[PDB]
Every structure is written in structure tokens, then in C-alpha cells.
Design a binder for these strands. Structure first.
Ligand SMILES: Nc1nc(=O)n([C@H]2CS[C@@H](COP(=O)(O)OP(=O)(O)OP(=O)(O)O)O2)cc1F
Ligand SMILES: [Mg+2]
Ligand SMILES: [Mg+2]
Lengths: 403, 554
DNA sequence: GGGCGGCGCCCGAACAGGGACTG
DNA sequence: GTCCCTGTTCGGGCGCCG
């Protein structure tokens, strides 16, 4: 077959990103995979005259003996020239299949191959890096699903004809399948789609349930007697929350604080202050007004560590106009791994964001850069990688979304 | 010889042309060396006489080789390097002896005329033109161009390393069990074969290299230990560094201090307890590399310590893959940490130091976590394996820290080591306001134009106090007010501030700061029994905060 | 005595980003 | 927006190797 000419975004040069250290198992898996890939013509060895590079590592499913090679194409995807089933979020169950192998059936535009260069390292730098470049559609490149969309539609036409109640959507390397069937009837239908895929040369996250994803609302404390400190914390929380919920009033509660009082003094709520607290509790139940998804803007996802394996997150596009607010929990306090929990959180949030809007968010991570970059790859299980940045969050925003 | 390997295509940067730079005068000694080198290179096809119609030239020179009576011919290709395309370096790091495993038989090989044995792109050879001046009246001086890799070109290292990898690929595929550490042209070859079958394999490797145009002269064929490799001495069961010679200079410049710190940092890989904190602090403001700097008495003491350390003899051992990696970390003051990586109790694989000052305010738990991360990445580089840790911090301290901290933080499998100075949190802020303690509403304000300010407090027991400051800022006034409240309170105190800045600083439980004011606040907090720090929105009429806001904003 | 590439440490200079402020 | 404060990156020295 002939290729599709792909160009970069005008005014942009290819990626030049240093490879990072890998473990022994990852390097050996990468050497095996790349050897068997160059024997099949999917990649070719290159030298130093190619000035581009993107990092490479490998993941391994739990209770599995097969490794999956993962190229961090975030920069190249960010520089590639540009080219959603709203029902999928409303389905009973959704299963995610990995169809990236199919992309290896299509050749890549020869003038573009230099941009997919990557370098395998060695333990203790026994040798220089071994450099490769792709000859076919690489997994994890944003152009791979676009160039392949025609073949995918041709493959999936008869299955969709025989199953018009099933919603199947394609993200970068992932195929999401949604149905309202029983948990066993659903599992048998995907096995039909796997076998259907295998019959054409395209070889095929366990099971999603989008109707059970929940919104975490902002909540106020209920008490039988309030201290000065209690009222001060409540007033701070309501003052911040008025930026999201404009109806929140604080004047009456604040009047209880007039004077220079001790923190542990008991303050009886007046009927006006009780009325204000009641109406504020009510206002915190209405959803946010005027929040519309802009496809041309980037999704921002903020995460806050609440303690004891509890995490809060907000998906928005402009500050205080939240598209979604939720929480993620886990077993608490025995041998918890904060970094492992954070990566599981970012993967689940990215999954929700792809299912709802078909776009990954940019994560503001409440972690030091070095800790995250030291350990996050040991817990990654996805074939995409979201863009992220690291932020030293204030404890006040932790207190605001706390439960 | 010249390798029959195919060349690496190289182009100039778009719109650029080859260099045209006049040759500068050179010593007659260096000119004789250059002619002796160049007539030999020209007899062997490595350089070719060009005549007219070659408009390019770059200056050349020569320096004595490392530890030989031989000369090295360098070219100052800085203009051509400016005008040459970009390369991706394939040398990702430096091999370390601690990453070597025990081998039955070991050899070290140096390749002869490494660069000059690898061909250069035929289309690119024009821009490598140079001239020899031949100072005599009777000799005119000859113009040459390079047919092989020059020394001084930006692209020569990467091209040579990639080409050597290409050349070694077949031998490696046929001999997977033979290990070849390949630094630029140094080859360390280890095998589980007996001496005698190892030597025949080494001869096969030398024949392989010779077929690809690379000679391995006997003068650099190391056959028996100790092997001199990468600046180290490799004995059968221990390794060491070739001797460090610290400069014994009397007066010290910036360049002298940089050389001292570099030698100490290189020595710290196997010498425990090396510290360079005060020596490095000596370098803060100096606006030139030639300035003389009087040594601090702290710096002199640290330097004498490092000297006495270096006087002792020390070795390292080799890696045993069937055992665990163990890193053990010890603390010195001033944000300095030393570590030892080993597998058997008193047999170090290597050692190291971590001293980076990250953040204006921090504590020792943060620094220990940073050291753990650094050691993890280093041991992944050298062994591809994460080590097991032995830290001078108690499980209770760590669980308290990562309970109270709002950021995600974590440390791998570790074990408490009872060797002081232990790492501890020096105070813990209360989670609920304390009954019976006085309540201090604090605030500060600063005139942005005139830089004058006020910082003060109002207490619930009636006490009010305002202090006027000069050359201050808003954040400084808030911190000064918190300091004032700490100074005038009992062993237990509630403090209410309106400042996210100061609250975020103090909440993180710092024990060291580059700000003297924060250091004073830290001392106060350590002297207190119970402290509770509450926050309120500013300029909202919240009682207490309103009174101090009205007092401090006169 | 100077030219090249790699890694390391350590410092400062630019640059980015969030909070608090003036009238 | 400006001022302040803080974190990150990138370049320049030195060390070491070739
Ligand atoms: N200062 C140096 N600059 C370099 O570019 N190199 C490069 C070019 S030569 C190569 C290996 O160096 P080496 O010391 O073995 O010199 P060669 O001429 O290759 O070899 P021999 O002297 O024959 O052993 O490294 C080495 C240096 F010491
Ligand atoms: Mg040599
Ligand atoms: Mg204030």
C-alpha cells in the first residue's frame, strides 16, 4: 500500500528528548521486542545523524508473562499536524481492548520516519545506546488512529450492522466497547469482536461501568455546638466556595465572630446564621451553571491528597468552572504506596475523561518532580500517557475539598 | 588501516558554508610533530593533499598525549562545529566498576588510531581543509583534507561510538556470554572461560576488529591484573581509583576551588564522608573565575577533614547479582548526606554524597527522601535494580510525616538504623485549637511604594502590639507578625493569620531555611509545647483579624 | 595553553507561575 | 496589570573518561 504524507505543525522541529534509566527487566524485554520487530521490518537501526529522539520503556500486565513496549510520544504528538460518541458514557458496561498491533500493518510516510527515533540503553552503560526508527504506524502516535481509521471502519462495518446496540469507539491504541447486555452476554460479545478482529490480521483495563461513576459534592459539617474556630473554618470554606457557587452568603455567620475571642469559645448560632447555613447547604446541591466543554481548550485535572488513601480530583477547563469533581479511595493505612495510588488515580481519571469527552487531561500533580519521575513507571498499565505538571498545592485547597 | 564500514551521512546546517579561517602561528616543535604525523597519514590515505579550488581552512595544533612521548593532532573546528548539523549522542552514561561482576578471565584492549581508522563522509571532506605552515624558508607548507574522523569535530565522538557498536554487533551475536564493556575505544572483555580459552576468544575478537580496520596494539593489551581501566585499578576481587592528588595551593582562586571541589566529588564515589558544603558556598557571588577568595575557617576545617579522609586506604568490591543491593544513609549537618551501597556488611560496592539544597525552606525528612530518590536512580543506572535501604529515621517519624504532609511522598522497603544523628521532626502543629492557650490574631502590612511596614498582634486577653519595620514587604510583615506572637506567648499558643504564604511555609514543618527570619521562627516553634495555626480570609471583617488589620495599616 | 562528546556537582541568570495588592 | 517569592531549566566553570 501507499503511504499518507504527514507533516509537522508549521514552525516546529521534531522531538529531542533524552532517554531515561530503565531497569534490567525492562531493557531485556525491550531488546527482545525490538529484535523481533526489526526482523519483521517494522523498525530499522539508525545512527547519530538522526538528531531526534523520544524515550521508551516497557510495562507488564499483572499475572501476565508478556511485556508491552511503550514509547512516550507526548512531544511528537504535541508537534504533529492535526487531522465523539456521547452515548458511550451512558452505557451499562464498557471493555477496553488493545488494538495497537493493527497499526503495524500500514507503512509510515518515509519523510516522517526520522521523527520516531528512539534509543535503547544498557545496564551500567556497557555499550552506547542502540537507536531505531519506525517504518510502520507506531503505537501511541496520534497519527496512527487517523491514518488507520478507514481500515478500522471497514473492519467494524459488519459487526456494527449485526450489533447496532453496541457502541465501539477508538482512542489512540484503545477500542472501547459499550453495551447494555448482561455481564456474561457482554463478555461473549467482545469475544465475538476479538475473533472478528483476528480474521483480518488485527490482533486483539478489564471492564468499565460508566453509569457508576460518581460526583463528589462539596459538603459542610453538621454539629450540635460550634466553637469560634469551627465558625472561622466554615467561613473560610464558604468564602472559597462562593467562587464556584455564587449564591453562598457569609455575612450572618461572620457576624457571630465580631470581637477578639478565643478559639475554643462556644458560639450559639442565631436563627439568622442557622438560616444562612441551611441555604448554603442547599446551594451546594445545585450543579454549577454555565460550564460548557470547549473542544479546542485543554482539559485541566487537579488532584489533592486527602489522607488515608483518599484523593479528590477536579476536571475543568477554566478555573472554578468544573466539568467534574470526584474522589478515589483505597485500602487505607497498612502498606499504602502514595505514588502507586497517585498513578492509579491519574489512570482512572484519564479513563473517565476519554470515555466522557474523548481527550486526555493535563494533570496538576501534588507531588515532587523527582519522586514521581523516580517511581511512576513501575505502576503504569495504560498505553497512553497524559501530559502533566507538578504543583506545590496549598493546604487550604486540601481543606476545601475534604470530607 | 581504514575501516571498510560504510560512512555516516553528514550535512551542513541549511544555508551555511564551510569555514574559512586563517591558520595561526605554531611552535617549530609542533610543526615538526604535525609534519611527521601528516606525511604518515597521507601515505595511508587518511588525509589527501588538496590544491586550489578548495576555498576552506581551519586552524590546527598539537598537544602531547596523556602519558606518552607521542603527539595528538587536534583541529580547532569551532566554526565548522557551529555550522554542522545536529547529532543525537549515543553515549548515555559512564560505566562504573561497581557494576562489574566477577569474571574468570579479563582483558583490556585499546584500539590504535581509533578516529583515524574510521572513514568520513566523502561529500563532507571538503570542509575539513587545513594547512601546515612549515616555518622554514625552503619548505612551503602543505594543504590537506581529512578522509577520516578528525579530533575536534563535533560529530566525531557519536559517529565513532555508533560505528564501533556496528562493528562489534556480529562478534556479540556470535558470543553472547562474553562481556565487552565498550567505552570510546577502550574494550574491557570478561568471560567465564579459563585462561587459555579466553585468550583464543580474545584473539578471535582482535582478528574481527582487524578485519574491520581496527588494530589493537600490544603495548595497550592488558593481560594480567591490576587492570588500568576508566581511571580505576581493577584487581581480581577489589577495585580502587587511581590516586587523587588534591591541590595543596596556599591562596585560592575560583578556578582552584572548582578544581578542589571537582576532585573531592570524584573521590567521594569510594571515599566515605566527603563534604564540600563550605567550599562550594565559597563560590557564591564571585563575578570572575580568576578572583582570589579568602577561605572561611569553616571551609578550612572541612578541607582538613577531607584531607584526613583521603589519607586512608579504601577499595570497592564487584557486583554479585544473586544478592540484594543495600544502601545505608548517614547525615551530617548543613544539609549533607553520605551513603554506602554494599551487599556484604563491610564490603562497599560504592559510596556517595548528596548535598543539593532544594527549596528556600525544607526539613531533614524532605532531604532524606531526595537522597533515597537519587540513590535509587543511580543504582538503576549501574545495576538495573532498586536497592534496599537502611535509614536513620524511625517508622513512627515517617508515618507522622506522610500523615501530616499534603503532598504524595514515599520511600521503598527500608529498615531503621540506630546510628545518630537521627532524622526527626522538630515540632508538630496541632490539628485542633488548644484549650487554655492565648489566641493571637496576627497581621502585617507594607507600603509598596515607600517599603515601610507594620507587623502586630491582638490577643483575646486584651494584649495588643504593633512594631514598625523598614525596607520590608507584605510577606515579610506577615512572617514578622507570626514571629512576634511566638516571642510574646507562653508554651502553648493559638495563632490566627490571614496569610496563605506564611501558613504554607510553617505548615510544611521546616527545620532549616535560607531566610534568617524563618530560622528565628523555627527556633521559636521548636521551643514551644503546643502551637495551633489557623487561617482566615483577609479583609472580611472576621473578628480579631479585623482589629489587627486596623492597627497594622495606620 | 587552547579542539570534541559523554556523565557528575554547583552556582547564577532567565523565565514561569501563584498570591496579594490600588483606587 | 505590579511586586514578591518560589521553583525549574539551561549554561558556564571544574572533575573524570576516551
Ligand atoms: N583528549 C582527547 N580527545 C579526543 O577526542 N579523544 C578521542 C580521539 S582518539 C580517541 C581514543 O583516544 P586515544 O588516547 O586511544 O588515542 P588514539 O590516537 O585513538 O590511539 P593510540 O594513541 O594509538 O592508542 O578519543 C581522546 C582524547 F584523549
Ligand atoms: Mg586508542
Ligand atoms: Mg494580612
Amino acid at each position: 500500500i501507499e503511504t499518507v504524507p504527514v507533516k509537522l505543525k508549521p514552525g516546529m522541529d521534531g522531538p529531542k528528548v533524552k532517554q531515561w534509566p530503565l531497569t534490567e527487566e525492562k531493557i531485556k524485554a525491550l531488546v527482545e521486542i525490538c529484535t523481533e520487530m526489526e526482523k519483521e521490518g517494522k523498525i530499522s537501526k539508525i545512527g547519530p545523524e538522526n538528531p531526534y529522539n523520544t524515550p521508551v520503556f516497557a510495562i507488564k500486565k499483572k499475572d501476565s508473562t508478556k511485556w508491552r513496549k511503550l514509547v512516550d510520544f507526548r512531544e511528537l504528538n504535541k508537534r504533529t499536524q492535526d487531522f465523539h460518541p456521547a452515548g458511550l458514557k451512558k452505557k451499562k458496561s464498557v471493555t477496553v481492548l488493545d488494538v495497537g498491533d493493527a497499526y503495524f500493518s500500514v507503512p509510515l510516510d518515509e519523510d516522517f520516519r526520522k521523527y520516531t527515533a528512539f534509543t535503547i540503553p544498557s545496564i551500567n552503560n556497557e555499550t552506547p545506546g542502540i537507536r531505531y526508527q519506525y517504518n510502520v504506524l507506531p503505537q501511541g502516535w496520534k497519527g496512527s488512529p487517523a491514518i488507520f481509521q478507514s481500515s478500522m471502519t471497514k473492519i467494524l462495518e459488519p459487526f456494527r450492522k449485526q450489533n447496532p446496540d453496541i457502541v465501539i469507539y477508538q482512542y489512540m491504541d484503545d477500542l472501547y466497547v459499550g453495551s447494555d447486555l448482561e455481564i456474561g452476554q457482554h463478555r461473549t460479545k467482545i469475544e465475538e469482536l476479538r475473533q472478528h478482529l483476528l480474521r483480518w490480521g488485527l490482533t486483539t483495563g478489564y471492564e468499565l461501568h460508566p453509569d457508576k461513576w460518581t460526583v463528589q459534592p462539596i459538603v459542610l459539617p453538621e454539629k450540635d455546638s460550634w466553637t469560634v474556630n469551627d465558625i472561622q473554618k466554615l467561613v473560610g470554606k464558604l468564602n472559597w466556595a462562593s467562587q464556584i457557587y455564587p449564591g453562598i452568603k457569609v455575612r450572618q455567620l461572620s457576624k457571630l465572630l465580631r470581637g477578639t475571642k478565643a478559639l475554643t469559645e462556644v458560639i450559639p448560632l442565631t436563627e439568622e446564621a442557622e438560616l444562612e447555613l441551611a441555604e448554603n447547604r442547599e446551594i451546594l446541591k445545585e450543579p454549577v451553571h454555565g460550564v460548557y466543554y470547549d473542544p479546542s481548550k485543554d482539559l485541566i485535572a487537579e488532584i489533592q491528597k486527602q489522607g488515608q488513601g483518599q484523593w479528590t480530583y477536579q476536571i475543568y477547563q477554566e478555573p472554578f468552572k468544573n466539568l467534574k469533581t470526584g474522589k478515589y479511595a483505597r485500602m487505607r493505612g497498612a502498606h499504602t504506596n502514595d505514588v502507586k495510588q497517585l498513578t492509579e488515580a491519574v489512570q482512572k481519571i484519564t479513563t473517565e475523561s476519554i470515555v466522557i469527552w474523548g481527550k486526555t487531561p493535563k494533570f496538576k500533580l501534588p507531588i515532587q518532580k523527582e519522586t514521581w519521575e523516580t517511581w511512576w513507571t513501575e505502576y503504569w498499565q495504560a498505553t497512553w500517557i497524559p501530559e502533566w505538571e507538578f504543583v506545590n498545592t496549598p493546604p487550604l485547597v486540601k481543606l476545601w475539598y475534604q470530607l | 588501516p581504514i575501516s571498510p564500514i560504510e560512512t555516516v551521512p553528514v550535512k551542513l546546517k541549511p544555508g551555511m558554508d564551510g569555514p574559512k579561517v586563517k591558520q595561526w602561528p605554531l611552535t617549530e616543535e609542533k610543526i615538526k610533530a604535525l609534519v611527521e604525523i601528516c606525511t604518515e597519514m597521507e601515505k595511508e590515505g587518511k588525509i589527501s593533499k588538496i590544491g586550489p579550488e578548495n576555498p576552506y581552512n581551519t586552524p590546527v595544533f598539537a598537544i602531547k598525549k596523556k602519558d606518552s612521548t607521542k603527539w595528538r593532532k587536534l583541529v580547532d573546528f569551532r566554526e565548522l562545529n557551529k555550522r554542522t548539523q545536529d547529532f543525537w549522542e549515543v553515549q548515555l552514561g559512564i560505566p562504573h566498576p561497581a557494576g562489574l561482576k566477577k569474571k574468570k578471565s579479563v582483558t583490556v584492549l585499546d584500539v590504535g588510531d581509533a578516529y583515524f581508522s574510521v572513514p568520513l563522509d566523502e561529500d563532507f571532506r571538503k570542509y575539513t581543509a587545513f594547512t601546515i605552515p612549515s616555518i622554514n624558508n625552503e619548505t612551503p607548507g602543505i594543504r590537506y583534507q581529512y578522509n577520516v574522523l578528525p579530533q575536534g569535530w563535533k560529530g566525531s565522538p557519536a559517529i565513532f561510538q555508533s560505528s564501533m557498536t556496528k562493528i562489534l554487533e556480529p562478534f556479540r551475536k556470535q558470543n553472547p556470554d562474553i562481556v565487552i564493556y565498550q567505552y570510546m575505544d577502550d574494550l574491557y572483555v570478561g568471560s567465564d572461560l579459563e585462561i587459555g580459552q579466553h585468550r583464543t576468544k580474545i584473539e578471535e575478537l582482535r582478528q574481527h576488529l582487524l578485519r574491520w580496520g581496527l588494530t589493537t596494539p600490544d603495548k595497550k593489551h592488558q593481560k594480567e591484573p591490576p587492570f588500568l581501566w576508566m581511571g580505576y585499578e581493577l584487581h581480581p576481587d577489589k577495585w580502587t581509583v587511581q590516586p587523587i592528588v588534591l591541590p595543596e595551593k596556599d591562596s585560592w582562586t575560583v578556578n582552584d576551588i572548582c578544581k578542589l571541589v571537582g576532585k573531592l566529588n570524584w573521590a567521594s564515589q569510594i571515599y566515605p564522608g566527603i563534604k564540600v558544603r563550605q567550599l562550594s558556598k565559597l563560590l557564591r557571588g564571585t563575578k570572575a573565575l580568576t578572583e582570589v577568595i579568602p577561605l572561611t575557617e569553616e571551609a578550612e576545617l572541612e578541607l582538613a577533614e577531607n584531607r584526613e579522609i583521603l589519607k586512608e586506604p579504601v577499595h570497592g568490591v564487584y557486583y554479585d547479582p544473586s544478592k540484594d543491593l543495600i544502601a545505608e544513609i548517614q547525615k551530617q549537618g548543613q544539609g549533607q548526606w553520605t551513603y554506602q551501597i554494599y551487599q556484604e556488611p563491610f564490603k562497599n560496592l560504592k559510596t556517595g554524597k548528596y548535598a543539593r539544597m532544594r527549596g528556600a525552606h525544607t526539613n531533614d525528612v524532605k532531604q532524606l527522601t531526595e537522597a533515597v530518590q537519587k540513590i535509587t536512580t543511580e543504582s538503576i543506572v549501574i545495576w538495573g535494580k532498586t536497592p534496599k535501604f537502611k535509614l536513620p529515621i524511625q517508622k513512627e517519624t515517617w508515618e507522622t510525616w506522610w500523615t501530616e504532609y499534603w503532598q504524595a511522598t514515599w520511600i521503598p522497603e527500608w529498615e531503621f538504623v540506630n546510628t545518630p544523628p537521627l532524622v526527626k521532626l522538630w515540632y508538630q502543629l496541632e490539628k485542633e485549637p488548644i484549650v487554655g492557650a492565648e489566641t493571637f490574631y496576627v497581621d502585617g502590612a507594607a507600603n509598596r511604594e515607600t517599603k515601610l511596614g507594620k507587623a502586630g498582634y491582638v490577643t483575646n486577653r486584651g494584649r495588643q502590639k504593633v512594631v514598625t519595620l523598614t525596607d520590608t514587604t507584605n510577606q515579610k510583615t506577615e512572617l514578622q507578625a507570626i514571629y512576634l506572637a511566638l516571642q510574646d506567648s507562653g508554651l502553648e499558643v493559638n495563632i490566627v493569620t490571614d496569610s496563605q504564604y506564611a501558613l504554607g511555609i510553617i505548615q510544611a514543618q521546616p527545620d532549616q531555611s535560607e531566610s534568617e527570619l524563618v530560622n528565628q521562627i523555627i527556633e521559636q516553634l521548636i521551643k514551644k509545647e503546643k502551637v495551633y495555626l489557623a487561617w482566615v480570609p483577609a479583609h472580611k471583617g472576621i473578628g480579631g483579624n479585623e482589629q489587627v488589620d486596623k492597627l497594622v495599616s495606620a
